[PDB]
Design an enzyme around this catalytic site. Structure first.
Site, PDB file in Angstrom:
ATOM      1  N   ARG A  58     -15.753   6.602  -2.070  1.00  0.00           N
ATOM      2  CA  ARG A  58     -16.838   6.366  -2.697  1.00  0.00           C
ATOM      3  C   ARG A  58     -17.021   4.752  -2.495  1.00  0.00           C
ATOM      4  O   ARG A  58     -18.248   4.390  -2.009  1.00  0.00           O
ATOM      5  CB  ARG A  58     -16.709   6.746  -4.114  1.00  0.00           C
ATOM      6  CG  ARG A  58     -17.001   7.823  -4.868  1.00  0.00           C
ATOM      7  CD  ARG A  58     -15.950   8.734  -5.945  1.00  0.00           C
ATOM      8  NE  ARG A  58     -15.188   9.740  -5.254  1.00  0.00           N
ATOM      9  CZ  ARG A  58     -14.108   9.689  -4.338  1.00  0.00           C
ATOM     10  NH1 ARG A  58     -13.934   8.289  -3.899  1.00  0.00           N
ATOM     11  NH2 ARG A  58     -13.446  10.524  -3.892  1.00  0.00           N
ATOM     12  N   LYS A  79      -1.357   8.953  -6.879  1.00  0.00           N
ATOM     13  CA  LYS A  79      -1.366  10.470  -6.410  1.00  0.00           C
ATOM     14  C   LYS A  79       0.044  10.935  -7.030  1.00  0.00           C
ATOM     15  O   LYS A  79       1.034  10.251  -7.059  1.00  0.00           O
ATOM     16  CB  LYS A  79      -1.420  10.546  -5.102  1.00  0.00           C
ATOM     17  CG  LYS A  79      -2.763  11.295  -4.552  1.00  0.00           C
ATOM     18  CD  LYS A  79      -3.612  10.268  -3.839  1.00  0.00           C
ATOM     19  CE  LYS A  79      -4.709  10.708  -3.124  1.00  0.00           C
ATOM     20  NZ  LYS A  79      -5.469  11.463  -3.907  1.00  0.00           N
TER      21      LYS A  79
HETATM   22 ZN   LIG Z   1      -8.395   8.416  -3.137  1.00  0.00          ZN
END
Ligand SMILES: [Zn+2]
Ligand SMILES: [Zn+2]
Ligand SMILES: [Zn+2]
Ligand SMILES: [Zn+2]
Ligand SMILES: [Zn+2]
Ligand SMILES: [Zn+2]
Lengths: 481, 481, 240
Positions: free
Chosen positions: B333, B259
């Protein structure tokens, strides 16, 4: 020579041919099924196989998989599946006939002459205008005489779309604001004598107090145009018109809030909104739909220069509201603000605008559907139903006062041109436009994500797609009933 | 001392007080209206004014604008407006009482004791746990005795939300996977004796073939947990359970697809999905709702290390499908893929999962509503109706095979973990999850955009928001009817 | 006494174009002219017994087909050539001529103000405006003036170190941006020193005190008008 496109259904012993396929098999004394059988696996939906020399007049026969004969409306996918199967399959058949350079093709109506016409004419379209290497343009014709009106209505709907792809695809130095206004004028006047076209110059635009449109326009040297299209197809000449408005930015560089270089060439298609609503109006007049329709497309270019709009400027829209231009790339917003004011002059029954407004729509629904923001569930229902027939979907997106608050940021102006936060950019751009409509039946369609085709809808080559033009024609069609 | 929160409606001569305000005005011989009148402009919705010394027991009286008495369900905004007015106004009143450091407040039920309880308890909440500067915690109580069940049910719904904000807000080094599992366990067991909690260790998780969850988890040193919560509230102990699943990433760094640094601290809230479904189940058991509910939260951390998942790896989910991990930041996911397999074991009536899945949801709807993808219009309708009551909106988003195609990219695996293109990221993440459900009634809620509050919903301080917990409790409430 | 102020009325960056994010705040790049002209209106309302000239070059900085190009060499009023390496370091250029003209007036003191540099904002970020001055007497009077108004000033260095960084010959006598990224406020001020020969000049970099959010409580969130009262107060005391 002719080619023949014939469809078959998925698998009983034999998977079934259509009446035309079955009739052709009898005319060749069982040869077509014989070779189909020794040729390999059963064709599934959208798959084709080509056979040569079965008949003197048809040296190339392309058999095409239509999927399950039973296919109807899919509740989960929100479209008529069967017609989607027929457009897909016929386009794949027709394109095999053009790769063999055959100049004409008889197409089997496949149980739905309208969608088979739409597959063939969409499927075969190209934009090779400024190339010296052009494709053979083949001419698709209905195989038979039994539903030539349904074939010709599909021809009509698929050309409206193709006009819009062509409009969108053309380079921006060729498709300037007066050039587009001239193409549309020419096409509309060939469609009906019940039309009026007004290519309004800068002089008129400034007499109408269209300050936010004029401030986008001034940074380019290319003269802007306000295009006013009328189709008076109603028996009652005083019947209130439906008005369509469309963002016609003919090239968007971003202005001083300049776009990144990567893939900027696609902003020649930032007039997609004008392309879409004008093509649907040309189709409505070819269709002699008994209604009055006005089309409104502010056309201009958005360019950096020494007279361009500056981040922070406050411009005045035709309703007197000031608008803080915080980002010059949120220009369509500005343009549509004046055009949607002017739309009210016409005392309209319905106001629909279309715009390639926001990359946020693309992140949101990315070409699975165009997004529609509407203050009326009646309008939503008619548009939604219209897209079940065409396969070119619509998905409702929220008009909440939540997004309005985000753009009612006073600071210098009544309204800001971009939302306060980055979130919900489609939703705050639509809430911006709500600030300029007082009409109880307005729909905003954000066309940005359905602007291009790559592989997603099979009957369209890769290029500018012309969507959602048939949803709009179909909506008008049903409304005039 | 006590403070008293009293509401009034917008403007007849006088704008009306509520019964309680009107009764208080008679008890002070007309003083309250007298001072209200000489004090300044009429209070509008959410506005407050504070008066001192009108009565010995109430040295601070805060009068609060409720808006129009007539307010009901708004067809455009999709909520009950009046209750939204009451939560907003009572929270603003209560917060004036805490800024004066008054430790208790009598709250007028305003015509809806449940939403006034919800305003007060939401409004007054804080998360100041690890600070030495804490706020006075005041205790809100119903003014009167007439609908103490409606007051207490609102208290109940607003605490479920507050548990979830607290869960979300806590720093990730404190709210690790076993720590969260322990808080939830403790809370659920205080709610009812009809509960069972299973904090499943790594050993169990690997005996269950949960390969895609295990591959996210291995790059951190923090032991993962599979939390299995049971609320057996049905009379028929064999009644099929509703199962709630929640993404519990306790901190998401991105892994090797790391990130950006900016604002990464908010990923302590990537277990929002587990926080939300577990708090609704604690509330359902406090409410002694007569249904069976299982809650499933895979808890782990997503960190870069020398054993982390690598872009390109292929992991095997519990149903045997291989999943190409193209981007390690699309980890939820992966986690949910195994948990949604396991959900099927329970033979469930309904499967609902919640996850802070995608920043694409935030670009799409940005906290105006949480997005729901569901293969059932019946589920959609019950959730939508549930959010009209709570004001915490839901907006349906499409489950089209279009987005599925984008993630059925073979290359090495059955399914890819990120869509092929960047477009429609919420839509392709949901289509990924569809690949692991075979149940006819599944709903996926993407909670990413409603994760934080800044100013958008007035009764919540700025911080982690706990949304859509009351939509879920309300949905369960109505289902158990 | 002469006050000079950068009056860029909008700064886009030119061809060295600004990022889009928050570019609307460059409507305030004429803050320097706003500040010195408002202090002179106040000094005349106050009938302060001194002579004050105010000098504000006003223009806009925009990309176009006739804009300045990175690398161009322009000639300032004192004949020095200036290599424009970055077109967004335009205030520097503007002030170079205005500070030449300031000398014509035979001034007792030369003070200029400019929203010059985001480097000032990284440095002091609205806690104080930065002042570079070749005179400790000027520094003392301005510092004392800000003790009364609460609108602080903090001295920043005029070292020949930063001058060397901008005396990069290459095509010109002076470069318009420093050689390295470091000390950008310090090298922009050293650039301006190249155009003053006066023993009492102060440069105030107003960039970080340009906006208010919550920092000084008596100002709403918006453009703040700082350090106007430090300047009026300085004039007030000087005319005593
Ligand atoms: Zn993530
Ligand atoms: Zn733009
Ligand atoms: Zn545009
Ligand atoms: Zn995550
Ligand atoms: Zn500049
Ligand atoms: Zn500047």
């Amino acid at each position: 020579t002719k080619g023949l496109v014939l469809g078959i259904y998925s698998k009983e012993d034999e998977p079934q041919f259509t009446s035309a396929g079955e009739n052709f098999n009898k005319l060749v004394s069982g040869k077509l099924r014989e070779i189909l059988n020794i040729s390999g696996p059963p064709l599934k939906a959208g798959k084709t196989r080509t056979f040569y020399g079965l008949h003197e007049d048809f040296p190339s026969v392309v058999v095409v998989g239509l999927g399950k004969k039973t296919a109807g409306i899919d509740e989960q996918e929100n479209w008529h599946e069967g017609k989607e199967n027929i457009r897909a399959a016929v386009a794949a058949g027709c394109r095999q006939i053009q790769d063999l350079e055959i100049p004409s093709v008889e197409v089997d109506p496949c149980g739905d002459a309208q969608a088979a016409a739409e597959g063939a004419v969409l499927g075969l379209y190209e934009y090779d205008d400024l190339k010296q290497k052009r494709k053979v343009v083949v001419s698709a014709k209905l195989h038979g005489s039994e539903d030539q009106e349904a074939w010709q209505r599909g021809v009509l709907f698929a050309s409206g779309q193709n006009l819009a792809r062509r409009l969108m695809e053309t380079p921006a130095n060729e498709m300037t604001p007066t050039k587009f206004a001239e193409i549309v004028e020419e096409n509309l006047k060939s469609a009906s004598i019940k039309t009026d076209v007004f290519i309004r110059p800068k002089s008129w635009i400034e007499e109408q107090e269209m300050g936010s449109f004029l401030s986008v326009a001034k940074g380019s040297e290319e003269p802007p145009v306000f295009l006013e299209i009328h189709y008076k197809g109603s028996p009652n000449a005083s019947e209130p018109p439906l008005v369509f408005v469309g963002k016609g930015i003919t090239f968007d560089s971003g202005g001083i809030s300049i776009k990144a270089a990567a893939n900027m060439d696609l902003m020649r298609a930032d007039m997609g909104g004008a392309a879409t609503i004008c093509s649907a109006i040309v189709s409505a007049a070819k269709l002699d739909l008994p209604i009055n329709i006005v089309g409104l497309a502010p056309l201009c270019e958005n360019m950096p220069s020494g007279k361009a709009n500056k981040p922070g400027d406050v411009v005045r829209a035709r309703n007197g509201k000031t608008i803080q231009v915080d980002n010059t790339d949120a220009e369509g917003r500005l343009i549509l603000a004046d055009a949607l004011c002017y739309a009210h002059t016409f005392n309209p029954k319905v106001i629909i605008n279309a715009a390639t407004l926001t990359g946020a729509m693309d992140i949101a629904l990315g070409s699975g559907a165009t997004g529609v923001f509407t203050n009326s569930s009646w309008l939503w229902n008619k548009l939604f139903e219209a897209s079940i027939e065409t396969g070119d979907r619509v998905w409702r997106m929220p008009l909440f006062e939540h997004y309005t608050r985000q753009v009612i940021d006073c600071q210098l102006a009544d309204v800001n041109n971009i939302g306060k936060y980055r979130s919900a950019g489609a939703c705050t751009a639509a809430a911006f436009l709500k600030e300029f409509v007082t009409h109880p039946k307005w729909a905003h369609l954000d066309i940005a994500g359905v602007m291009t085709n790559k592989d997603e809808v099979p009957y369209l080559r890769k290029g500018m797609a012309g969507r959602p033009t048939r949803t709009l024609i179909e909506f008008l069609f049903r409304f005039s009933q």
